[PDB]
């Protein structure tokens, strides 16, 4: 035990410390907003928790201090085990939340891309026509597209493959909660639970529209300035609804993946002190 190894301490550390950053650079710049982004934050994780192994068997001691830290926060064996934890069960779900909210808006942006040709001049100034019957035929079918469950619409748990994975009703609705999505985000699916996109803005949209009474023999409906002002004021909220709900869960997102970041942060430093140990000597 009186035989000493600064040189290969050294390597060992900084080997660690450079997959580390690496890891860490990944998460911070690689946004979540696609299957192929998130594969890429995925393979960081692991090949941070592989570091750490490699760390775990390599010789390098921590002192009580380190120890301790490491404890507080989260030897070698628990801290790979927890942090995997982490990264796998709430950072990849906030993950998956992200690509597949986004996806969902970008097909709600596409919609109101549309609506500048759905508002045409009315008989005067004082009128316009609008496009009720085509607006709402395109939300419809987001709607049907978005209350199906599959890839495309399933927040948590996060899909692979060809089956849906499912959750106890238990674990569904702490995911709920936890993203402040409304109940009627929770569907059950088979032997479980999952929680979907939030389509309660649009199918208030598409009941707003009806409520406006039935279109002419265009399928358009004409409406004084007044009346198109009014409408438009609610649309608007409801796009604004949406905005909100995203906008929460991507800041969610941002938190997660800081918490995820500061548990990183506790290990680099670790390793950094580590390291002045190895390089450093009493008078
Ligand atoms: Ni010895």
């Known amino acids: 035990g009186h035989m000493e190894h600064r ?11 450079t ?4 890891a860490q650079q990944t998460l911070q710049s690689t946004p ?6 998130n594969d890429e934050r995925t393979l960081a994780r692991q090949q941070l928790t592989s570091s750490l192994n490699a760390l775990a068997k390599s ?23 927890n942090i995997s934890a982490i990264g796998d069960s709430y950072l990849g779900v906030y993950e998956n939340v ?20 759905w508002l045409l001049p009315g008989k005067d100034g004082n009128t316009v026509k609008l496009d009720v019957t085509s607006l709402k035929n395109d939300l419809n079918s987001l709607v049907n597209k978005y209350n199906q469950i599959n890839s495309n619409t399933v927040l948590f748990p996060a899909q692979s493959g060809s089956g849906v994975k499912v959750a106890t009703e238990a674990e569904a609705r702490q995911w709920l909660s936890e993203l402040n999505l409304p ?6 699916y088979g032997s ?27 399928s358009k409906l004409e409406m004084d300035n007044a009346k198109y002002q009014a409408w438009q004021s609610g649309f608007k909220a409801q796009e604004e609804n949406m905005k909100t709900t995203l906008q929460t869960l991507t800041q ?32």
């Open 7 to 17: 040189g290969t301490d050294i390597i060992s550390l900084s080997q660690a410390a």
């Open 19 to 22: 997959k580390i950053h690496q």
């Open 32 to 37: 979540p907003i696609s299957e192929e982004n």
């Open 59 to 81: 010789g390098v001691s921590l002192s009580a201090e380190q120890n301790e830290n490491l404890r507080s926060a989260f030897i070698w064996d628990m801290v790979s085990q």
């Open 98 to 117: 992200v690509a597949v909210y986004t996806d969902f808006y970008q097909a709600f942006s596409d919609i109101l891309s549309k609506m500048g040709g």
């Open 183 to 188: 109940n009627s985000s929770l569907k059950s």
């Open 192 to 218: 479980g639970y999952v929680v979907t996109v939030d389509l309660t803005p649009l199918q208030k949209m598409v009941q707003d529209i009806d409520g406006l009474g039935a279109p002419g023999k265009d």
């Open 252 to 283: 969610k997102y941002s938190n997660a993946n800081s918490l995820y970041d500061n548990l990183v942060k506790v290990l680099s430093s670790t390793i950094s002190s580590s390291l002045e140990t190895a390089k450093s000597f009493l008078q």
